[PDB]
């Protein structure tokens, strides 16, 4: 029993964090094989962020200007490049601690663990979800750029996020491992705005499944609501609508508990309309939408990673 917000084992990823410096401005990078990925905004100084042009700044700079460090042992940059917002450095040695890896772009409502780094050294790890507005509610201070968001499937680490910038509302923004930002954001210190976020309904239902598995059942009403009928009520409360694919995603969770997916939506509907009534679900008095049905299974089935 017990249900926590869990981060993935950060072992394999810690082994890829390198420190990329450039005289005044330093940040973190990922060292997989003989490639070093680090946000392109490292080729800047305190004045270049105000209004940048990475297109030509990369051109006027070369291999020697980069200062890579694997803790203490500096690395030789033998090739520069710019795939969108990330900088592809080339090193004279493949990372001996490189895990089996994938590069994956995720959808909103999907989760990953973030290994927070400063000067190529990991300081902490936490579970995050791509909000439906493509921002993350992260915990990053200046110098946390480079820090990755990943997921572990079997023995293979799947990289999904690179930290680039913060927004004025305290929330965070970054690109995939190819440099394509998540959302309509650019890597500049310009007027940027997160926009209306919604609640990840598929993750809220999956969260209540973990509460049913862990004993909390008071909210389990014996009524039903059609899929569209639920989407009628849910949308009033700023909750992402439920697709039929979402129902298929909750299928295994439903089968493993006995409670139907359509029944669970009716238990959620009255939960939203009437409120908590003092009581808490899983120790919280708010609905947690940061648990995909997969994170619910991996926690409540002792799913380990090699």
């Amino acid at each position: 029993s017990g249900f926590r917000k869990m981060a993935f084992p950060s072992g394999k990823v810690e082994g890829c964090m390198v420190q990329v410096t450039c005289g005044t401005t330093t940040l973190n990078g990922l060292w997989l094989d003989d490639v070093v990925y680090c946000p392109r905004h490292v080729i800047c100084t305190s004045e270049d962020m105000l209004n940048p042009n990475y297109e030509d700044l990369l051109i006027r700079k070369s291999n020697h200007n980069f200062l890579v460090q694997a803790g203490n042992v500096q690395l030789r940059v033998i090739g520069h490049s710019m795939q969108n917002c990330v900088l592809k450095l080339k090193v004279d040695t493949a990372n001996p601690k490189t895990p089996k890896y994938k590069f994956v772009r995720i959808q909103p409502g999907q989760t990953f663990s973030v290994l927070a780094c400063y000067n190529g050294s990991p300081s902490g790890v936490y579970q995050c979800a791509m909000r439906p507005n493509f921002t993350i509610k992260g915990s990053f201070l200046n110098g946390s750029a480079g820090s990755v968001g990943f997921n572990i499937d079997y023995d293979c680490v799947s990289f999904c996020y690179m930290h680039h910038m913060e927004l004025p509302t305290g929330v965070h923004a970054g690109t995939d491992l190819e440099g394509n930002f998540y959302g309509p954001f650019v890597d500049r210190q310009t007027a940027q705005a997160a926009g209306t976020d919604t609640t990840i309904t598929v993750n809220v239902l999956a969260w209540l499944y973990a509460a049913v598995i862990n004993g909390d059942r008071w909210f389990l009403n014996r009524f039903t609501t059609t899929l569209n009928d639920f989407n009628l009520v849910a949308m009033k409360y700023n909750y992402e609508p439920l697709t039929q694919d979402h129902v298929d995603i909750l299928g295994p969770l439903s089968a493993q508990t006995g409670i139907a997916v359509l029944d669970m939506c009716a238990s959620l509907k009255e939960l939203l309309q009437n409120g908590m009534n003092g009581r808490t679900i899983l120790g919280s008095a708010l609905l947690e939408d940061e648990f995909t049905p997969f994170d619910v299974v991996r926690q409540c089935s002792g799913v380990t990673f090699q």
Partner: peptide, 6 residues
């Protein structure tokens, strides 16, 4: 208040 490069 503008965005912040980390």
């Amino acid at each position: 208040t503008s965005a912040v490069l980390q």
